[PDB]
């Protein structure tokens, strides 16, 4: 196409369009030429960067400081051959519909900002580093589809330019920036308004599919109001990022011949389990840090304190953290019923210093009043919505509910939100930060003594600010209900909203002893496939029917994710009937299906490392119950070989028979939207022994 087909009937022109999907969007379009030749800085994808950038002093930083429109996009989309598109899509809420041209004008003020800013060399060097490392360390791909993709490159690019396609910035082009600025003009605008409620209102009609839209242009007063208001107030450009990763020359594995996370350092405050990389030799280093506090279980008020504190807290430094999010180097902050959690992920270069900034800012943190109140009301409405959630989701809430020493309820959470004031937690934060605990976990292509200095530096800064004094070891105490071990217990809690009924029967075996591990796993999976045979497939009671294990508190368990509106005792008798089914069916399972199924559990267990993240997640599970058994793989496999057909019958009749003395039977009913009974939850935890605790590591 030697001409632009957007032929002057569509510039500065509205199109209020009814979609088919229940969607709300807005496109702004620019026909820009085939600058595929102009890949030196690639100004269209540079605008995908810059227009995509949502950082300090940003446009979207202001409009989410104004709260109207949540997200957006603007960048180079390929149109036809000879020209290309530049599609500017945004999120739509209902409130932005009255503010549309003002948002457009916000767009225009950011355009005029970067027009007054002109070109930026530091963006070129930074994003050139980004492209060089990203295409340097792009990991792998599915083969099929990738080949046709780079074959699509192979037309536009020769046989040495299909990998190096847009993946290196050669020379900075301020005047191509000025060219697309001449493309990016208010005169150059298609407007595509998307709203479903204009049915019976839209008349101008698409040819093939037959959908209807409108022209309905913008008068020149608002056009010129876009034109004349090329001024600059609140909006500011970002600065250079403080960090780039440059250490990628990998450091070889030294004298430490252990293949595991090793506890190399333990003080009154610090405890450093530490590992170096031997598998994949990748320059990322992923970090894991728990923030234990006794202040965790204090109140539902202190729950929301810690919760909403971490919530706004991670939200607040995210305003700082857009360069890191833009770096693709991620992290995590997450709460625990024991406290908080910290993760830091990405490359091992400048994680300590950036992390020190994170630590310093969360330590020395200022508090806004009203912004917080909006957050407070938002989670208030969230908890209001929480009563209308699914019975299987609430069944997992029962899993966290009846399986502890103590918890708080959502009604307790409900009245206490009235009790929230900001100086309360604002004074409680130095109450909080004077005593809590950080255990250290480090893993990557990282040395030992440098990591010691980094961790010591960070905790030294911590003691420098708020003087976090250590705990007692009994002050790291842990939260489970003693059974009569044969009696079956249940209560019902009728739903408010969802008409489906929830049910599950639980069975704690024990701790994760190698005995009870293969007991639970093999018994659960050996009933899983006959359940898939008959109860799910044959009976078809409801779709949400599932069986699984429980693994929490260092304590095993048995679950049955079943949600369906049935009579209670009726579905109880059905689950009992499947218990009888497996009672005979296991005795019916001969040695062949036995061996194939234990091989299935083996290959379930047998999987090589894939990243640091998956192994580190399993490592984190090793951490939280303090067990660290990094070689229970082969051990539990060799134990699995010890199980016979008679051996599992020994596992049946002691614990799983109808008259078994270890019948760990308990249920919780959930009714619709409309043995003996349990009187009170106070009665549920009133008269009880408790358990021996697991030997730690």
């Amino acid at each position, epitope marked *: 196409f030697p001409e632009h087909p957007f032929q002057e009937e569509h510039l500065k022109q*509205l199109y209020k369009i009814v979609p088919i999907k229940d969607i709300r969007n807005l496109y702004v379009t620019f026909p820009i030429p085939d600058l595929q030749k102009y890949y030196k800085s690639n100004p269209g994808h540079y605008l995908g960067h810059l227009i995509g950038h949502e950082g300090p002093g940003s446009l979207l930083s202001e409009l989410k400081s104004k709260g109207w429109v949540n997200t957006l996009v603007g960048g180079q989309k390929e149109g036809a051959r000879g020209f290309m598109f530049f599609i500017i899509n945004v999120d739509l809420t209902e409130e932005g*519909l*009255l*503010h*549309v*041209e*003002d948002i457009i*004008l916000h767009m225009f003020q950011y355009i005029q900002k970067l027009r007054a800013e002109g070109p930026q060399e530091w963006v070129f060097q930074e994003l050139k580093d980004l492209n060089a490392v990203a295409f340097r360390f792009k990991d792998k791909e599915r083969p099929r589809g990738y080949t046709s993709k780079i074959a699509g490159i192979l037309h536009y690019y020769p046989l040495e330019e299909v990998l190096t396609a847009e993946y290196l910035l050669e020379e900075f082009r301020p005047d191509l920036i000025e060219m697309v600025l001449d493309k990016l003009r208010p005169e150059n605008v298609r407007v595509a*308004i998307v709203s479903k409620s204009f049915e019976g209102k839209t008349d101008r009609t698409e040819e093939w599919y037959g959908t209807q839209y409108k022209q*309905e*242009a*913008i*008068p*020149d*007063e*608002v*056009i*010129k*109001k876009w034109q*004349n*208001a090329d*001024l600059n107030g609140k909006f500011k450009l970002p600065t250079k990022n403080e960090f780039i990763p440059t250490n990628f020359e990998i450091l070889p594995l030294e004298k430490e011949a252990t293949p595991y996370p090793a506890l190399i350092k333990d003080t009154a405050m610090s405890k450093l389990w530490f590992k170096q990389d031997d598998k994949f030799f990748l320059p990322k280093a992923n970090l894991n840090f728990e923030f234990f506090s006794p202040f965790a279980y204090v109140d539902p008020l202190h729950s929301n304190m810690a919760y909403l504190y971490l919530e706004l807290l991670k939200d607040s430094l995210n305003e700082y953290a857009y360069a890191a999010e833009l770096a693709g180097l991620s992290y995590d902050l997450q709460n625990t019923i024991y406290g908080m959690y910290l993760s830091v992920k990405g490359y091992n270069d400048k994680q300590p210093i950036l992390l020190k900034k994170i630590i310093e800012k969360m330590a020395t943190f200022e508090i806004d009043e009203k912004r917080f109140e909006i957050i407070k009301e938002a989670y208030m409405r969230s908890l209001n919505n929480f009563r209308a959630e699914q019975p299987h989701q609430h069944a997992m809430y029962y899993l966290r509910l009846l399986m502890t020493e103590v918890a708080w309820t959502k009604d307790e959470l409900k009245e206490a939100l009235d009790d929230v004031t900001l100086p309360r937690l604002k004074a409680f934060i130095p109450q909080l930060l004077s005593r809590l605990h950080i255990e250290a976990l480090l893993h990557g292509n990282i040395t030992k003594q440098a990591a010691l200095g980094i961790m010591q530096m960070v905790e030294d800064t911590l003691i420098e600010h708020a003087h976090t004094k250590p705990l007692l070891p009994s002050q790291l105490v842990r939260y489970e209900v003693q059974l009569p071990d044969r009696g079956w217990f249940v209560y019902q809690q009728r739903n408010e909203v969802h008409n489906n009924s929830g049910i599950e029967i639980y069975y704690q075996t024990d701790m994760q002893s190698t005995s009870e591990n293969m007991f639970l796993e093999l018994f659960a999976q050996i009933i899983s496939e006959p359940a898939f045979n008959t109860l799910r497939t044959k009976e078809q009671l409801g779709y949400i029917v599932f069986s699984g294990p429980r693994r929490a508190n260092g304590i095993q368990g048995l679950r049955f994710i079943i949600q369906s509106e049935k009579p209670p005792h009726y579905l109880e008798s059905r689950v009992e009937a499947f218990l009888i089914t497996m009672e005979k069916s296991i005795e019916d399972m001969t040695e062949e299906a036995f061996q194939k199924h234990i091989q299935a559990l083996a290959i379930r267990r047998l999987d090589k490392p894939k990243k640091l993240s998956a192994e580190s997640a399993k490592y984190w599970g090793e951490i939280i119950s303090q067990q660290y058994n990094f070689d229970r793989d082969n051990t539990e496999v060799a134990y699995l070989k010890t199980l016979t057909k008679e051996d599992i019958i020994k596992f049946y009749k002691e614990m799983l028979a109808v008259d078994a003395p270890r019948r760990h039977k308990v249920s919780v009913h959930v009714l619709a939207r409309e043995p003996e009974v349990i009187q009170n939850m106070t009665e549920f935890k009133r008269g009880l022994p408790l358990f021996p605790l697991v030997k730690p590591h």
Partner: antibody
Amino acid sequence: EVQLVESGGGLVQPGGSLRLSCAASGFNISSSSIHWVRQAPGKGLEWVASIYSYSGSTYYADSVKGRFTISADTSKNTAYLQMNSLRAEDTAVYYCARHYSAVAGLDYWGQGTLVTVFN
Amino acid sequence: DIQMTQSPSSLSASVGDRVTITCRASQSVSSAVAWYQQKPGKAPKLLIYSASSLYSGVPSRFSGSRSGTDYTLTISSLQPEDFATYYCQQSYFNPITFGQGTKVEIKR
């Protein structure tokens, strides 16, 4: 040329509500829009309201933000304003006055109706 | 939002007098300011759009001027029909302020 025939501004109560109907004839409200002006007798000027019938963008002052609902039948180029929660200090001549395509140009006017919020 | 102060609020000046009327802007305002006449008991007018540009039907005896931020209307000469309450405008998506009143009286 540009005809601003206001109507509908009549009788209301303190706390009351109305609906305007301004026959903005002779031009396009698809073109440069009319707006709404407070002027209580013996008092100065305040902007009331703004319909963008080509785009649906409603605008109000901060005390009256949200508690109105403005509309305009732009096929007829006929403006409306559902007035709501009308309090007694708002007894004011509300001008259906056209803003033309200028940077600040509001040149055409109605005579304005004294929507009276009397007792 | 940004307020506007029409200085002077009132005046007395005979037919044929050159009158400077300055709407005082609160902040840095671009060319987003009109100028208004209201004859009392009548619907108002626009005197000057674009802070300097005369509208059709309004005579040449009214010469607006973009004057820094506190923009200034300069009536070049008064008439017996010019004895009217005057105003201005501030046109943004900000809440639009106006004149604070300026009625021309006579000297006698």
